[PDB]
Amino acid sequence: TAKKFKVVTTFTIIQDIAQNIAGDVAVVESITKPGAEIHDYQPTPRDIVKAQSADLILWNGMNLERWFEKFFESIKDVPSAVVTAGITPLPIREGPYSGIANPHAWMSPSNALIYIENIRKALVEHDPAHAETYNRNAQAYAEKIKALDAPLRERLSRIPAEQRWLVTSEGAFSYLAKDYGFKEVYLWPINAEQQGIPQQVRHVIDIIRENKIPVVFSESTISDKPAKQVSKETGAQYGGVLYVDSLSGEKGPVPTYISLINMTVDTIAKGFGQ
Ligand SMILES: [Zn+2]
């Protein structure tokens, strides 16, 4: 093919969803590499000229990419589209960012359907020559995503409701916890350069000890040391790494949005003895 419509995304979750909609007619690339910390990412000149070569830039909004506004004002004549219109935000519950939208809306499979619609609408609006392809690819992919919820809901429901305590590092799982009826505990409400983490470690250690919570987790773009200290000082198992803010590379263990949701739920479920 002569040349394909070029789409660039802020991070890897959006890249994979968008690439499933784009199929063979457009190439979708993430600005951030898999594994990069996305909230406070610092773009380089390489990143700017990459977005500058695109025909469309997709971003999450909802207070995720603190770096996006400054980055985008460096780009000339490239349209952007936020992919989260129509999602009901959940407010952050604790800390300095209390009350503002929790950005991690893709961790509810139901919300992924809205991500799909907004990305489809953006691709059709900006590359209308391939509307039928974007529309059919969005339809087929939405059907897959609709089918994601049922086995996960069933698996997690076998954990007695009173025992559903999800203890993580970043409070990045609020939308998944809402869907499947978990109560939330975390070492920091949202990724940021911040004081107070060693103090919250002790506070969470209390809550683990009081409620005899069996398991604690970290996440794949942040340090596992606080979660491992929590499990060391309590009885609780270190349940491993959850996947939320990044996919892996294409030959890694979490190459797709579908694998991210499925593997995060599997790891949570195994932590509770299924
Ligand atoms: Zn995050």
UniProtKB/Swiss-Prot annotation:
Assembly and binders: Monomer.
PANTHER family: HIGH-AFFINITY ZINC UPTAKE SYSTEM PROTEIN ZNUA-RELATED, METAL-BINDING PROTEIN HI_0362-RELATED
Source taxonomy: Bacteria, Pseudomonadati, Pseudomonadota, Gammaproteobacteria, Enterobacterales
Pfam families membership: ZnuA
Coiled coil: none
SUPFAM superfamilies with a match to the protein in the record: Helical backbone' metal receptor
Record-level Gene Ontology MF annotations: metal ion binding
Role description: Part of the ATP-binding cassette (ABC) transport system YfeABC involved in iron import. Binds iron with high affinity and specificity and delivers it to the membrane permease for translocation into the cytoplasm. Also binds Mn(2+) and Zn(2+).
Keyword Iron: yes
Residues engaged in binding Fe(2+): H39, H104, E170, D245
Keywords from the named record: Ion transport, Iron, Iron transport, Metal-binding, Periplasm, Signal, Transport
Entry remark concerning the domains of this protein: There is a second metal binding site (site 2) involving Glu-125 and His-126 which can bind Mn(2+) or Zn(2+). It is unclear what its physiological function is but may participate in protein-protein interactions with other metal- binding proteins.
Assigned GO CC terms: periplasmic space
UniProt key word Nucleus: no
Xref: InterPro entries: AdhesinB, Bact_metal-bind_prot9, Lipoprotein_PsaA-like, ZnuA-like
Protein's UniProt name: Iron-binding protein YfeA
GO annotation terms (biological process): cell adhesion; cellular response to iron ion; iron ion transport
CDD domains, sorted: PsaA
